[PDB]
Design a protein around this ligand. Structure first.
Ligand SMILES: *[C@@H]1O[C@H](CO)[C@@H](O[C@@H]2O[C@H](CO)[C@@H](O[C@@H]3O[C@H](CO)[C@@H](O)[C@H](O)[C@@H]3O)[C@H](O)[C@H]2NC(C)=O)[C@H](O)[C@H]1NC(C)=O
Lengths: 193, 48
């Protein structure tokens, strides 16, 4: 609803082909956000019951008082399942909104698992206006093996996770592309028509 | 980075007929493999 793109989207959906059940667990509580302001990351681009609202399994951190101190938080997958976890960067529409929201001239994101070495830099630029907005959110993902930690760090433009996704049942499925809705039957063979 | 290379900002620029590369080292907090933290990312090419 807030426009942008989902990095490596198809590679994920394909990985979702083999999963039969999720379990959403809380990795970073929205309440526990320190010296930032997690409450006011909403936008009229994403309306929920007349008000401005936002995505629900992430949070769009804004600066506190008039500062945005460097984020430095981590999470160890002590579960015994593979963990799918999604975050995101915001891309602003100007330097005006940059200070207005996040505070600082230059910003970066730095997530790092045992096999991830990401350093992300928002890109300011003029662009055509989609759904009212003309900034963009670009989202990202990874799978976290058991007993692996994943350490974030960013001084702005950072959309953080609250919820991650446990791969419980793994198996067979596809992301079928039909437009029919359910008809309460049971088969052993299904096709999009 | 001071310890090992002095310069704060740093790059690599490998160049040929076709190749036009310029690399920038990403500092990031990350979990320890082989008693070690920092990573080394290698590259390659066939020089005609
Ligand atoms: C996240 O949490 C997991 C689960 O606690 C941590 O994994 C555990 O780490 C300990 C060491 O801190 C492992 O013990 C090691 O065992 C070897 C061989 O038995 C021993 O020679 C070492 O001295 C060491 O004590 C333990 O096996 C391991 N648990 C399992 C079953 O994986 C982990 O430290 C945390 N994630 C990381 C590394 O970021």
């Amino acid at each position: 609803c807030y426009p942008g793109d989902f990095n490596d989207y198809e590679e994920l959906k394909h990985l979702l082909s083999r999963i039969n059940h999720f379990e959403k667990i809380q990795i970073i509580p929205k309440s526990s956000w320190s010296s930032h302001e997690a409450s006011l990351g909403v936008s009229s681009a994403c309306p929920y019951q007349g008000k401005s609202s936002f995505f629900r399994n992430v949070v769009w951190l804004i600066k506190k008082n008039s500062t945005y101190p460097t984020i430095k938080r981590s999470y160890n997958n002590t579960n015994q399942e593979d963990l799918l976890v999604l975050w995101g960067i915001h891309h602003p529409n100007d330097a005006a909104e940059q200070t207005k929201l996040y505070q600082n001239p230059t910003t970066y994101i730095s997530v790092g698992t045992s096999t991830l070495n990401q350093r992300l830099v928002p890109r300011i630029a003029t662009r055509s206006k989609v759904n009212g907005q003309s900034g963009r959110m670009e989202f990202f993902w990874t799978i976290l093996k058991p007993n692996d930690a994943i350490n974030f760090e960013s001084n702005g433009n950072f959309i953080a996770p609250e919820y991650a996704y446990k791969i419980v049942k793994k198996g067979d499925s596809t992301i079928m592309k039909s437009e029919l809705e359910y008809g309460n039957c049971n088969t052993k063979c299904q096709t999009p028509m």
